[PDB]
């Protein structure tokens, strides 16, 4: 019957899970890894990426 | 300075190339204009320059 505490814990856990997963989003960029953009792309538009 | 027409594009902020890397490298955050014109008439003797 401990629905409320379990719900609060699950909500916090899923918020953290969404936050940790959101960084895999490409956001329309060439790559999702910073050093790849900094090394294999020219600064003039790697900066805007 | 004087360079060939093959590397006229190498003079740019953060662009790869032998001339850019070893002779003159532009900063990544650069504000300014680049002016390039042919110099075959002025700087090409019949024997060679």
From Swiss-Prot, chain A:
Coiled coil segments of this chain: 6-49
Task performed by this protein: Subunit of the fusion protein that is processed upon entry into the host cell. Mediates fusion of the virion and cellular membranes by functioning as a class I viral fusion protein. Contains a viral fusion peptide that is unmasked after S2 cleavage. This cleavage can occur at the cell membrane by host TMPRSS2 or during endocytosis by host CSTL. In either case, this triggers an extensive and irreversible conformational change that leads to fusion of the viral envelope with the cellular cytoplasmic membrane, releasing viral genomic RNA into the host cell cytoplasm.
Annotated protein name in UniProt: Spike protein S2'
The organism of origin for this protein: Severe acute respiratory syndrome coronavirus 2 (2019-nCoV)
Species classification: Viruses, Riboviria, Orthornavirae, Pisuviricota, Pisoniviricetes
Curated annotation (Swiss-Prot), chain B:
Region feature Integrin-binding motif, mapped onto this chain: 4-6
Record function comment: Attaches the virion to the cell membrane by interacting with host receptor, initiating the infection. The major receptor is host ACE2. When S2/S2' has been cleaved, binding to the receptor triggers direct fusion at the cell membrane. When S2/S2' has not been cleaved, binding to the receptor results in internalization of the virus by endocytosis using host TFRC and GRM2 and leading to fusion of the virion membrane with the host endosomal membrane. Alternatively, may use NRP1/NRP2 and integrin as entry receptors.
Subunit structure and binding partners: Binds to host ACE2. RBD also interacts with the N-linked glycan on 'Asn-90' of ACE2. Cleavage of S generates a polybasic C-terminal sequence on S1 that binds to host Neuropilin-1 (NRP1) and Neuropilin-2 (NRP2) receptors. Interacts with host integrin alpha-5/beta-1 (ITGA5:ITGB1) and with ACE2 in complex with integrin alpha-5/beta-1 (ITGA5:ITGB1). May interact via cytoplasmic c-terminus with M protein. May interact (via N-terminus) with host bilirubin and biliverdin, thereby preventing antibody binding to the SARS-CoV-2 spike NTD via an allosteric mechanism.
Protein name stated in the entry: Spike protein S1
Source species taxonomy: Viruses, Riboviria, Orthornavirae, Pisuviricota, Pisoniviricetes
Residues of the full protein shown: 400 to 448 of 1273
């Amino acid at each position: 019957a401990l629905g409320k505490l379990q719900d609060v814990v699950n909500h916090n856990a899923q918020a953290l899970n969404t936050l940790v997963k959101q960084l895999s989003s490409k956001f329309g960029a060439i790559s999702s890894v910073l050093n790849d953009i900094f090394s294999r792309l020219d600064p003039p538009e790697a900066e805007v990426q | 300075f004087v360079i060939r027409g093959d590397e006229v594009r190498q003079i740019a902020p953060g662009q790869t190339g032998n001339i850019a890397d070893y002779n003159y490298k532009l900063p990544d955050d650069f504000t300014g204009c680049v002016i390039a014109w042919n110099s075959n008439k002025l700087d090409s003797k019949v024997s060679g320059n």
